Amino acid sequence: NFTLNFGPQHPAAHGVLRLVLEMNGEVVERAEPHIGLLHRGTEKLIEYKTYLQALPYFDRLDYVSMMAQEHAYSLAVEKLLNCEVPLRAQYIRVLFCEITRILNHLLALTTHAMDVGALTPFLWAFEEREKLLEFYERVSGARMHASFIRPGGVAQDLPLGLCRDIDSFTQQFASRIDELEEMLTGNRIWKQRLVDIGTVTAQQAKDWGFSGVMLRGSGVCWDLRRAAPYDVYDQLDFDVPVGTRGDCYDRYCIRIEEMRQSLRIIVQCLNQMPSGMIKADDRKLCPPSRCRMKLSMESLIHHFELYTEGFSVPASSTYTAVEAPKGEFGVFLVSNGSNRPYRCKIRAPGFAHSQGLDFMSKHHMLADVVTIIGTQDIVFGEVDR
Amino acid sequence: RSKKSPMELISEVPPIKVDGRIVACEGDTNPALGHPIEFICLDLNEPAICKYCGLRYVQDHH
Amino acid sequence: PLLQDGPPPGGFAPVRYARRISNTGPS
Amino acid sequence: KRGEIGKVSGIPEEHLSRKVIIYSPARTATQSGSGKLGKWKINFVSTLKWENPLMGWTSTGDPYANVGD
Amino acid sequence: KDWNTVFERSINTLFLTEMVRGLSLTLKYFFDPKVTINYPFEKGPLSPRFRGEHALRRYPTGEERCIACKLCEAVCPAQAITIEAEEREDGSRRTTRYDIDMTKCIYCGFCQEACPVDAIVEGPNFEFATETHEELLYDKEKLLENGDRWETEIAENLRSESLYR
Amino acid sequence: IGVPPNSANLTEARRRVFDFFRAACRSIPTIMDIYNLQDVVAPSQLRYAISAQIRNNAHITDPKVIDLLIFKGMEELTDIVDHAKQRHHIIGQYVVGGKTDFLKNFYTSNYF
Amino acid sequence: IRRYVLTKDN
Amino acid sequence: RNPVGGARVHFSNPEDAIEVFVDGYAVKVPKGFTVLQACEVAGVDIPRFCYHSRLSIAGNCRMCLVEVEKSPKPVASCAMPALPGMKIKTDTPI
Amino acid sequence: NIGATLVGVDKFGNKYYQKLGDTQYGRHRWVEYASKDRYNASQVPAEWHGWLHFITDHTGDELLS
Amino acid sequence: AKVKQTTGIVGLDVVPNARAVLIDLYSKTLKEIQAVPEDEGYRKAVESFTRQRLNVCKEEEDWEMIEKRLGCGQVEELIEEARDELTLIGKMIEWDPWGVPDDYECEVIENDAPIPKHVPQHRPGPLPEQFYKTLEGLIA
Amino acid sequence: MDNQFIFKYSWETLPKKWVKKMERSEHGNRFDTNTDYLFQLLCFLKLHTYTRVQVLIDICGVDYPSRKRRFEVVYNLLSTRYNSRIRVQTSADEVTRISSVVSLFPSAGWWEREVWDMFGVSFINHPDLRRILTDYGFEGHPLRKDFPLSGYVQVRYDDPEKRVVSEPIEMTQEFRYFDFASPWE
Ligand SMILES: CCCCCCCCCCCC(=O)SCCNC(=O)CCNC(=O)[C@H](O)C(C)(C)COP(=O)(O)O
Ligand code: SF4
Ligand code: SF4
Ligand code: FES
Ligand SMILES: [Zn+2]
What we know:
The structure is cut from a larger assembly and holds 11 protein chains of 11 kinds.
Chain C lengths: L27
Chain I lengths: L4 E5 L5 E4 L10 E4 L13 H7 L8 H4 L1
Antiparallel strand pairs in I: 1-2, 2-3
Chain J lengths: L18 H14 L8 H19 L3 H8 L4 H21 L9 E4 L20 H11 L1
Helix pairs in contact in J: 1-2, 1-4, 2-5
Bound molecules: the ligand CCCCCCCCCCCC(=O)SCCNC(=O)CCNC(=O)[C@H](O)C(C)(C)COP(=O)(O)O, iron/sulfur cluster (2 copies), FE2/S2 (inorganic) cluster and zinc ion (ZN).
The site of the ligand CCCCCCCCCCCC(=O)SCCNC(=O)CCNC(=O)[C@H](O)C(C)(C)COP(=O)(O)O has 21 residues of chain F, from helix 1, helix 3 and helix 4.
PDB class: electron transport
Keywords: Complex-I, electron transport
Entry title: Cryo-EM structure of Arabidopsis thaliana Complex-I (peripheral arm)
């Protein structure tokens, strides 16, 4: 058999994808993904930064789901600090994590359908993506890389009209999802290009470290928001969709259902969000108000010490994982008692999913390899740090 | 008037007359939009300079 | 201050989240 | 010196013949605290620095410019 | 199965009854108002918290607010700021060199929220693409010009988030 | 296939060195074709280059260090066999190559 | 921390 | 445990050496050391503002106040001489 | 620029228009540049920049005072 | 009463007979754990839970009832546990790790630093009673 | 199911000669074992009925230059059936070959390749142990504490040579290290 190379440099498929395929005829026999083109030394750069200075690195890991990584990093720091977060901050974090989940799912579904050949749903979904990123631009000052979720509480408070605008969005996102489904779900070509492609058994998913939609499509009811709940996720009502055949079509139906349930969670968070402060009151770990630093001596001392040295995490090590839109995103943070992390491994779900591309694509058509790559929803920011 | 450096511009503002022996300088009418509060002792003959603003305060009567 | 972002009194109006059926066509 | 680990590490041969100083940094004279004491450091004596003739920034060509610190 | 069900699903197979339902959906969006904006004339909505081009502010008296505390250079996660300071002729603590690398800047706003005197701010300007790399090495004069040119909008925005910061 | 278990004595280390050297020597014909080295280098100068590397790394007496050196050399050989590295790279590494040294260094710079 | 050390204990 | 900053205590004789309990730990110090110095031998570093090891003692700032069992009020560790059998407490609520 | 209200004029001569939106918006805040030579793509002063980008509701004539 | 239509798990297939493929695996497990020394913690637990599950599989004829009383997965997730325990027994026998060293020592650190409540924590429900019965068997 | 139950069960059932350090806390129940018993422990913890750990989350290394056994290899494990996490750690220096667990967990391959690339730890019986993240021909293991942050070599285009070439590194602005440590810690 010959040795064929797909390097798509154009971001019509990821952009830094490099597959070296061994094709017998039209079937592919082994898929070896060549990674390392987006390895920017993020893990080593964390060890040279303060715990506050290393927060923006997590925005650029999974650049389609930004708040998901910040939530995990903040939870790891809180676990190593035993820092309690106010209820309003927890509700805001859950709200902006479920907005993030919808953003990631909307991008993934349509960048996967564009690979197949469906161009129309891509623009329709990016319209709602822009509508959602407007909310990102409102709380923070950045459309994508918002350093909003922070270890103590949250960076700053919500503008006045944000809740009303988010409710107005949720009044029509259901019809938007209905249109997006009606363009793809009933189509026979979409069924023929997804059904029975990429079948994975539950044992294979467990052995290869699959998580999220890749794992729940095989029948495994494993959600980290229900197995190891964090924040206020245990006070919210939402269902966990589970697949039956493990193919690419189940990964798509579940990726629809997880976004409808995300809309449901967003509505509940809007309705039940309480009043109060948005940051922990231990100003030894959180910044003082700008009116208090210019009027009180100890507040100014705290500001000065926090914005140069930052806080010091007691010597310990732990692993915290959250339910990122791709799957289980974990951070292994090691502290030696100083103001800089000693070691911080980033466990990316894409790393464990692109590794299993070899067995998912074996004995499949060449044109069926792009659907297998797109159904895993891989971004290379996290695959190679 | 770009030819005037900020030093020359802050050297042209007349000192503020204060009746008491001490004045508090915040840097702006709205406290939250200025610099940290600075208490200046007006017990000399030369005008007393704010170390943030550069504004000068002088005692009015005594 | 004491005027903080949140839901209006009585909560927000209910919003559909399930699939709406479409029976279009004579068949 | 049995620098076998240096040979199986990946450090270039030019940087494996450096002369270093092993010392314990002392307490600063401007503070009375004694927290940053008891740790030992390796000083690579990295002094070859110059000035960028575009912005005045400090340029260097020594990889071991800040590792030991 | 049932004859009626078999016939009904066989008609849909041969009459493409699930592609007409998508063609109708596309045609409905064809006759529909567009959502595109004329970028040169009309701009997209923004927020007062927008983190754009940096600007160094000055007091209304004409004195620059920067006090060379170097509190923004130590919080900068990208090491994009370099500050050199000394005692000015009046004896005040001011900067001689204040330059920001906008090719290293990640536009995170940490410098803006760390300044104790509101000297460095990220203004609303986001249209400053240059034709040369050295034009992106902003210095003190360039930053002060930015602060003077965007002073009113920056002041209004700082008034807006005074209730939140 | 799999990474071999760590050696227990110097004789096994020597055997692995010889096996790796033989494999590298058999890899010489492939490199001359994958890269246009036909009218560049004799088929023995490269062989001498690998021999020289083995010989100037021949003062090691720790079997673990020898095994690690062999593993790194095998990784380098496998990379060179593939089209991974650029052409001039091997030609920049694998080619065999007056007053006072002190006075020339003094004329060059203060940092010896 | 309760770092007691186990032993064979016959 | 080691003294703070690797401080070397010079015992002129083994006989003139009292015993104190800085935090329940047996500490041997010569007669003449203060509570602050005894704590420095036992690895505990007391806050200080006005005390300098090369200057005369002057208990101004009152920042090195510790708890002593046979004391109704906190004592300035910089100036209080160490007594045999004295139990110092530094991390108590007082 | 049809069925629209002119909010104000600029020192460079740029005219700013506004139209009322109902539920979906579109062409409700734009500029008619007084130049045509490529218009430089950036000629809006700081008093009018905020109004155009919906940062502030002040027109810019009111932002001057 | 009827045969299980689907297991709900991809790759795992319904076994038409589950009371006869489990009563044999448990018997094999009990007849092969004998090679392990009597006073070892592995043998006691592996011979306790295997006896209870074997008795349960002998009492009730229908798979639904077996699923109810054991209450730990489907009968198709118990066969894959029995077949793995059988493999583990053989691997233990060939490795023979049963020899307690004379110089053995273990540092049992016991940390108690609390963690916050919003922090993700794995909180399962109460295990079936056998998971504790085997535990008291091991301690005793 | 829980840290209180898993600790007590593994105390009794596990062979004593394998594990030499057992921390039980809320940050995570850890097991520290010798490198010659790692595969045995992980195979036991993958097949036992009450400790069905079927998911290997990741394999990471930690660099401690002050220790004799410099590198610490951490195996974060997950049990889906009992909803519990277990962490297993070993220690290895720069010239020891620890056993590979790709036989038990197929996902261990890329993590072991990344550990070898980043720290230089070699794994016995690994189907293919080559660098996975660093550039082709990369020399040195970057995630070591003695490796400089910016590395040793730099990449630029050489017009006369008509190819991208590698040159010794030379920064226009060096990395400024700020020492914020406090003496009153
Ligand atoms: C294009 C090809 C790509 C790959 C080329 C190779 C690149 C790596 C080159 C190898 C790197 C190494 O150091 S790997 C080999 C290093 N290992 C040793 O040198 C073992 C110590 N030497 C001895 O024991 C003896 O001197 C001995 C020399 C054996 C003979 O002498 P005797 O038997 O009398 O005793
Ligand atoms: S915005 Fe962030 S990266 Fe840019 S100069 Fe300020 S602190 Fe540095
Ligand atoms: S801009 Fe602000 S933070 Fe930066 S040096 Fe000047 S006063 Fe300090
Ligand atoms: S140090 Fe000031 S009272 Fe003792
Ligand atoms: Zn002032």
